Design a protein around this ligand. Structure first.
Ligand SMILES: *[C@@H]1O[C@H](CO)[C@@H](O[C@@H]2O[C@H](CO)[C@@H](O[C@H]3O[C@H](CO)[C@@H](O)[C@H](O)[C@@H]3O)[C@H](O)[C@H]2NC(C)=O)[C@H](O)[C@H]1NC(C)=O
Ligand SMILES: *[C@@H]1O[C@H](CO)[C@@H](O[C@@H]2O[C@H](CO)[C@@H](O[C@H]3O[C@H](CO)[C@@H](O)[C@H](O)[C@@H]3O)[C@H](O)[C@H]2NC(C)=O)[C@H](O)[C@H]1NC(C)=O
Ligand SMILES: *[C@@H]1O[C@H](CO)[C@@H](O[C@@H]2O[C@H](CO)[C@@H](O[C@H]3O[C@H](CO)[C@@H](O)[C@H](O)[C@@H]3O)[C@H](O)[C@H]2NC(C)=O)[C@H](O)[C@H]1NC(C)=O
Ligand SMILES: *[C@@H]1O[C@H](CO)[C@@H](O[C@@H]2O[C@H](CO)[C@@H](O)[C@H](O)[C@H]2NC(C)=O)[C@H](O)[C@H]1NC(C)=O
Ligand SMILES: *[C@@H]1O[C@H](CO)[C@@H](O[C@@H]2O[C@H](CO)[C@@H](O)[C@H](O)[C@H]2NC(C)=O)[C@H](O)[C@H]1NC(C)=O
Ligand SMILES: CC(=O)N[C@@H]1[C@@H](O)[C@H](O)[C@@H](CO)O[C@H]1O
Ligand SMILES: *[C@@H]1O[C@H](CO)[C@@H](O)[C@H](O)[C@H]1NC(C)=O
Ligand SMILES: *[C@@H]1O[C@H](CO)[C@@H](O)[C@H](O)[C@H]1NC(C)=O
Ligand SMILES: *[C@@H]1O[C@H](CO)[C@@H](O)[C@H](O)[C@H]1NC(C)=O
Ligand SMILES: *[C@@H]1O[C@H](CO)[C@@H](O)[C@H](O)[C@H]1NC(C)=O
Ligand SMILES: *[C@@H]1O[C@H](CO)[C@@H](O)[C@H](O)[C@H]1NC(C)=O
Ligand SMILES: *[C@@H]1O[C@H](CO)[C@@H](O)[C@H](O)[C@H]1NC(C)=O
Lengths: 49, 641, 48, 48, 193
């Protein structure tokens, strides 16, 4: 009927506590927001299910 | 001339709430009908702005300029004429002057010896109907200079005329990358004493290439029945979201880290937020200080015994010296102009003072100048092929300089030789001392030589007549390996006291990171310096001064969700710190830092623990209802009487 | 059914120290992977 | 293809110009690793 | 075309010419001329012993050897304050381990390459994201509207139909951008429509 909801912090995963890495990650635009939006979409659906 | 009038005249510093001022066009580009997000030095919304007011006799304080400034004056009849900027303000350092005078504006950059109480003033109605600005008691001397500008007077006395209203000047000053950016705006205002409620934007005015360190500044009143006031705000590096309307004017904005609602608006990129719960930039505790822990060795390493040795070994028999149990300083090598070549692999030379080394070997030899290219990893040629190969994945530095002025001799130096041939190209860091004859012909051979049976070495007769590329070069390779083992060579960096159970920026032996330290019970064996996680990250360390083992844990962090009714119903919101037992939020005081700058919610009594995290700014009630906005683990939230 | 990480508050004192050597969900969490709780608890689903 | 997988090790040993050529890799490889996980979780969510 | 241009000019030893590039380090770059990490521009150099090296030594060319902190990009410091290389504070014209902060080049035409003086120029423009003030020899064409053309305004080349807009660009704006960060409108540099 469900599976575990997961939220993955895309900045802490890619660039864990590095500011100079975070400034390079911003060059890739929206991809972390797309990943957060997709996983939030799955998470909201487990309650709907 | 300069004058010593009275004193600072009591304590004029007042305070005010700068609502939505100090927004400006971030770039010289048009946009319209768009929600645009920009990161820059901006005035925070609702900031505690400083205020100074003319009421008699008065003076102007010198004020900081750290990260750049917002300046404004609520004005009539042109009392504020300009500003002084610099860092010593006393001709020891060059400083900047901006003034508007009776002829025109000036901008000037000089070694000004400013007055202690600088002033300008006008003589009224001096027999020619004119009022005249005879006084320029601002500096005694302008000893040397590097920039000047003059043009006209910056007096846009606006519409409505003759002071029927008050007139607000706004300015923003950003000294960045040697260029002093000014932005400005004028507006009529009718507020009796405060700073005005409402939205406006500053255009970029001028960009001045002044090149000076500014840490402080002052403003300049005129002198002679009118009265005036000025505001000082400080810029900060922030994110702002700008509503460019259809005419391309910044008509509204969201300060992206003012409060949790403004951060949701900045996440959804909208001025309205619908009823719901939204994840936003995740919180973390910042480090409260730094720790550095290198070994407490003090004796300087034997670099002279390598780099200034009497005579270098021959490149077929290159000498290896072990550097150990000592303090290096690679800056006093690297800044020495005597090195003709100094190139490094797997490290950059600027970092060699920040970092420790497992063990170090210096390999040392003499080669011809055009063969210096052959010492780098992966190379080919008589040296690299037959007698000194670096491994394909070498890490270290190779350093080289010519030594004709030490080892080249007019009768020929022949004590320096290399191997001409070998059965097979040598394995990396091999050394071959053998003298056996090389069978360049098909026949076997014996004895001292044969036809096509060579002696395997060949010598060089260095003589100081030879051209560049044929000269001798003394060369050294420093051949360390890094961070995966209990190091014993280090830079000159001083260690510190240790601290535990707090978040800190640690550095053990050059393994930098952020975390909270703890007394572990892991039994590291004597050859082990670091312990690692499944994610290949370091999770424990043996301290290099007291030989105990510390656990490293990332200091507290987690997701932040903001809970809201629709913004057109209310601006009140509640925060869920997901995954947290929030008895820590009292430790999330803004004495030290946190990534989300806002922290008003932590006030208490409206704090509720849940299995999902802890919820702040919403009140727990016993009566159940339909699930309006879902938190998790049976809890929901809603907006009601 | 062996439910790995239900999400019910890892209050650091259960996730650092001796348990940290034997609990993979603490490494997942420390790398920014977070498991969120279901809206309806195992009591609310039992009541329905 | 970076010189190390540990993000702080890249920063501890390289200057602000040469580090970015190593960090772009770890970013591009990690970012790909998330896009694979999230695609696989959307396809599992479609089955569930 | 370039927004505005500044030329920086100075003399240094030839082997330190490598320090003028961005991200580099050494006694020039750390203490008297730093380029920004994202520099846009050109660095140009040549030896000038044949114009300003002299047999007794030229000594009119000087460079800072000490500073409490490395200078910010495009900073310049005229100060002559004594530098406290020793642990003690100090005053006056000199002291033991208290240095005058500058040290001279001595340039004599006997020096080898690398020790010889180089005249260096750095050109330091920013491009296309603002109203340009100085550029190349390319002659402008006549202008045409409502036809597809390969346009080029101030060096912003592209392809499109051109049309009379009613957008109000402020005096500091040269280009409009779309949601997609593509150029959507332009102010013509010969008729300001
Ligand atoms: C407002 O402040 C200005 C800056 O101090 C000041 O500018 C100064 O104006 C005088 C008069 O024009 C200049 O004197 C020179 O003028 C021309 C230059 O070609 C020559 O014909 C003259 O012989 C003379 O050399 C100053 O040089 C000029 N200062 C600077 C730094 O440019 C205004 O005069 C000030 N106005 C008032 C009312 O005080
Ligand atoms: C963009 O800037 C435009 C110019 O200021 C502005 O248009 C102006 O808007 C007002 C109010 O609608 C108009 O005032 C007239 O409106 C009608 C007649 O059309 C009458 O009832 C009024 O008495 C009055 O005469 C201005 O005439 C109009 N100006 C122009 C040139 O059209 C836009 O509103 C601005 N857009 C935004 C979003 O700021
Ligand atoms: C821009 O000007 C600033 C003001 O002179 C200057 O800041 C100053 O830097 C020095 C060197 O660090 C500080 O001197 C103190 O250094 C440490 C503490 O930082 C102490 O251990 C020493 O005993 C000594 O007291 C100054 O205190 C500091 N001043 C301020 C107001 O911060 C900048 O370095 C200058 N930057 C450039 C690029 O010129
Ligand atoms: C303004 O005040 C300063 C003191 O703060 C005056 O400086 C003094 O001047 C006298 C000579 O008149 C000297 O004997 C003192 O040694 C000076 N003291 C300092 C601390 O420098 C200054 O002269 C005053 N200006 C005028 C025009 O009178
Ligand atoms: C700053 O001003 C001083 C004072 O005029 C200048 O120092 C003079 O320099 C010349 C040329 O070397 C000497 O003949 C003088 O004897 C110096 N005077 C003093 C009192 O030192 C200095 O050169 C100027 N510096 C800059 C960079 O503009
Ligand atoms: C639109 C416009 O003003 N064009 C002018 C033109 O009239 C003038 O003859 C020419 C001379 O420099 O410069 C350009
Ligand atoms: C502004 O800061 C001062 C102390 O610096 C404080 O007394 C004052 O109450 C503050 N004002 C506001 C609105 O916080
Ligand atoms: C009136 O103007 C003239 C010319 O500038 C000037 O010489 C005279 O001093 C002025 N009158 C007074 C009272 O200053
Ligand atoms: C090497 O010799 C030169 C000249 O004596 C000296 O300046 C330098 O400091 C020496 N370096 C070492 C490591 O001995
Ligand atoms: C570190 O310094 C202390 C105090 O001088 C000393 O007792 C200790 O032996 C040193 N540590 C090592 C590894 O020698
Ligand atoms: C939001 O509230 C305003 C009144 O402040 C109302 O005019 C508007 O229609 C409402 N919109 C929605 C979607 O509820
Ligand atoms: C809910 O009811 C209990 C008694 O059943 C009471 O102790 C508790 O204080 C109530 N909750 C609140 C928020 O007061």
């Amino acid at each position: 009927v469900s599976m575990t909801k997961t939220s993955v912090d895309c900045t802490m995963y890619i660039c864990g506590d590095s500011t100079e890495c975070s400034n390079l990650l911003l060059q890739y635009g929206s991809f972390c927001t797309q990943l957060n939006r997709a996983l939030t979409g799955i998470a909201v659906e487990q309650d709907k299910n | 001339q300069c004058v010593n009038f009275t004193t600072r005249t009591q304590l004029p510093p007042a305070y005010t709430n700068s609502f939505t001022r100090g927004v400006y066009y971030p770039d010289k580009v048009f946009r319209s009908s768009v929600l645009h997000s920009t990161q820059d030095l901006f005035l925070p919304f609702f900031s505690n702005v400083t205020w100074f007011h003319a009421i008699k006799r008065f003076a102007n304080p010198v004020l900081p300029f750290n990260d750049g400034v917002y300046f404004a004056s609520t004005e009539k009849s042109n009392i504020i004429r300009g500003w002084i900027f610099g860092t010593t303000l006393d001709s020891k350092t060059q400083s900047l002057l901006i003034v508007n005078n009776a002829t025109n504006v000036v901008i000037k950059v000089c070694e000004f010896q400013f007055c202690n109480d600088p002033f300008l003033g006008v003589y009224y109605h001096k027999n020619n109907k004119s009022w005249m600005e005879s006084e320029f008691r601002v500096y005694s001397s302008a000893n040397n200079c590097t920039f000047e500008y003059v043009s006209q007077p910056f007096l846009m006395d606006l519409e409505g005329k003759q002071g029927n209203f008050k007139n607000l000047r706004e300015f923003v000053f950003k000294n960045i990358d040697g260029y002093f950016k000014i932005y400005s705006k004028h507006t009529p205002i009718n507020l009796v004493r405060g700073l005005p409620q409402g939205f406006s934007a500053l255009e970029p005015l001028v960009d001045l290439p002044i090149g000076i360190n500014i840490t402080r500044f002052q403003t300049l009143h005129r002198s002679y029945a009118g009265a005036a006031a000025y505001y000082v705000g400080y810029l900060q590096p922030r994110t702002f979201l700008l509503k460019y309307n259809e005419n391309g004017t910044i008509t509204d904005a969201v300060d992206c880290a003012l409060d949790p609602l403004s951060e949701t608006k900045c996440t959804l990129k909208s001025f309205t937020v619908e009823k719901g719960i939204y994840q936003t930039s995740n919180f973390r505790v910042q480090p409260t200080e730094s720790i550095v822990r290198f070994p407490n060795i003090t004796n300087l390493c034997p670099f002279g015994e390598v780099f200034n040795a009497t005579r270098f070994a021959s490149v077929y028999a290159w000498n290896r010296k072990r550097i150990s149990n000592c303090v290096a300083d690679y800056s006093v090598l690297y800044n020495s102009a005597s090195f003709s070549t100094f190139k490094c692999y797997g490290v950059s030379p600027t970092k060699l003072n920040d970092l420790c080394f497992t063990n170090v070997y210096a390999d040392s030899f003499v080669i011809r100048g055009d063969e210096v290219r052959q010492i780098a990893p992966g190379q080919t040629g008589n040296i690299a092929d037959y007698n000194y190969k670096l491994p394909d994945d070498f890490t270290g530095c190779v350093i080289a300089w010519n030594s004709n002025n030490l080892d080249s001799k007019v009768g020929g130096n022949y004590n320096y030789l290399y191997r001409l041939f070998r059965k097979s190209n040598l394995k990396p860091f091999e050394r071959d001392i053998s003298t056996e004859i090389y069978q360049a012909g098909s026949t076997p051979c014996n004895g001292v030589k044969g036809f096509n049976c060579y002696f395997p070495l060949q010598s060089y007769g260095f003589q100081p007549t030879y051209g560049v590329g044929y000269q001798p070069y003394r060369v050294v390779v420093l051949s360390f390996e890094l961070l995966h083992a209990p190091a014993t060579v280090c830079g000159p960096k001083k260690s510190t006291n240790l601290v535990k159970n707090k978040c800190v920026n640690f550095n053990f032996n050059g393994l930098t990171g952020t975390g909270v330290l703890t007394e572990s019970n892991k039994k590291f064996l004597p050859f082990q310096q670091f312990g690692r996680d499944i994610a290949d990250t370091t999770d424990a360390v043996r301290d290099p001064q007291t030989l105990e083992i510390l656990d490293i844990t990332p200091c507290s962090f987690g997701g932040v969700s903001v809970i809201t009714p629709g913004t057109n119903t209310s601006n009140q919101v509640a925060v869920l710190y997901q995954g947290v037992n929030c008895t820590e939020v009292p430790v999330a005081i803004h004495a030290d830092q946190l990534t989300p700058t806002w922290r008003v919610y932590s006030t208490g009594s409206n704090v509720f623990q849940t299995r999902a995290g802890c919820l702040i700014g919403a009140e727990h009630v016993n009566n159940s209802y339909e699930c309006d906005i879902p938190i998790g683990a049976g809890i929901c939230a809603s907006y009601q009487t | 059914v062996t439910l790995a990480d239900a999400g019910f508050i890892k209050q650091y004192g259960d996730c650092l120290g001796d348990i940290a050597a034997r609990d993979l969900i603490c490494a997942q969490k420390f790398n920014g992977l977070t498991v969120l709780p279901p809206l309806l608890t195992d009591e609310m689903i039992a009541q329905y | 293809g970076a010189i190390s997988s540990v993000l702080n090790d890249i920063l501890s040993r390289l200057d602000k110009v040469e580090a970015e050529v190593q960090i772009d890799r770890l970013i591009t490889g990690r970012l790909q690793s998330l896009q694979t996980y999230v695609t696989q979780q959307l396809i599992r969510a479609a089955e569930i």
